[PDB]
Amino acid sequence: MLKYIIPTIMLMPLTWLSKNNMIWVNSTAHSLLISFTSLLLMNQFGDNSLNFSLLFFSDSLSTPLLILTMWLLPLMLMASQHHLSKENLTRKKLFITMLISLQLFLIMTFTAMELILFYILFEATLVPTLIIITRWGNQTERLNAGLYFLFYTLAGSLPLLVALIYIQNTVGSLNFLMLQYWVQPVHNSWSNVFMWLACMMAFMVKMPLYGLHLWLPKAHVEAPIAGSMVLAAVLLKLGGYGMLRITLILNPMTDFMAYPFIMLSLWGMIMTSSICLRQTDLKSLIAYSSVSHMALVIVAILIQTPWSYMGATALMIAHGLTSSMLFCLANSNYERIHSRTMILARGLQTLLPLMATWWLLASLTNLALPPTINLIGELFVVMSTFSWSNITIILMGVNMVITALYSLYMLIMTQRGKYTYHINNISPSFTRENALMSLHILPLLLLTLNPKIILGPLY
Amino acid sequence: LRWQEDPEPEDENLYEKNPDSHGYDKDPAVDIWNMRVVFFFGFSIVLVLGSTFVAYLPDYRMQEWARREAERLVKYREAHGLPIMESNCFDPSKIQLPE
């Protein structure tokens, strides 16, 4: 993975040693070259993972997440240009340095072969993420959002640190390949009930699990656009990727320990989908939408069926591009009206015909219109949960109805009706904004042709 | 006033000075080259060559091979009267069940 780690690090010298007026051009161009080379990670074999060295490996689960991570960095640089156009040159480069250092940690996190190395890099993404929110956030609440984002993750992570080190002493190694062969079943005892919770609650809070999500409406709303894209597209998937790994060493205790979290997830997604029907803030509505889609992933990982693990991988990648696109669309409006209220600017389809086309495609994939990979992942999880229990079809179906209601409600309030009379500065959509939306939706709709590359190791 | 603070600046519409602006930068020279790198490296390279690269992956996940192998075994077993597929993946002779 040194062929991606080293180039990413070289983006820091490139930014600091480039001309004053070329920091965006040079960082965007070279971060796109890095994304192009990540396609070499698709050399996946049907029996064995692609094991590079003692430190790093890449199977069919890490590869789609790695390509998504390296693809977002240039998109994050396009989004941030407007609101950083009038900031001190050194601080513009510090902002970019934070994004690069965040990509550096992520790709090493998704490829670490040893769980303690995974934990360090999993836990290292907090520092650059917190700095982005609190320093370059726009509101006063950004300071309270960082603390919520910080102590929710750490409150769950620190127990995970104890559990991981405990497992190494007992097993003798945290290397994932070793655990695949030396794993022993987990006896049903009170001691193992709290081993299981320690290994999972760290990853639950990042998904997030309903109940432990109050940090997400704060961190995804008070952060800049570049922060909101990585937060919702990738950083929520560190929880999903973690559970997809650590549940190997938690059987058969997951059979009964998953009940409280399945109920919180099955019922939680109805609750959070309903919240989206009455949200007065457009960005906050998108944040609450993430909790509902990530509730399907938690259920998908906790039932442990091949159809559920294929759905979870597709759902994470699918929601990664859709959630990022929605934040960008909501941000294009904000850069004109400078307010997050949903009911302030209306009928925008009359003034921005092409940007409303992106709104339609963003909403259609959000409500899982087939044959989009959004529907493929959600469909696979529904089939897997039906076999788990036929009654779950009621909750899954109800969420599909509510999901389509708030998705189109967001599309009808801002893109239809009558334009707000007193808003007279809705300038035509820039090429930067239009290209930002294409780079989301176009790769999202292409994966439908060959979806096997986002279906994970169990394909 | 409670302090000496600059009044809040008004927003700058990049269309006013450069009606051909692509939204990337105030400088027209930088603005055009910002757009070219995004489009060429984003659309002409990653999406088009990446799409072609993914389309021609050399038998991703060994799925095409397993189809040929299944055909070879099905032909072999049907030509000798053996069952198409047995209920035991491992020969019981190597298994030593308790007591």
Binding site: W136, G137, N138, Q139, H338 | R2, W3, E8
Partner: peptide, 19 residues
């Protein structure tokens, strides 16, 4: 609008003997 930065009201919370 413009990014928010602390005013005198916010800072004087940290000027007392205790928090």
């Amino acid at each position: 609008a413009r990014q928010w930065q602390p005013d005198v009201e916010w800072a004087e919370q940290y000027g007392g003997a205790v928090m």
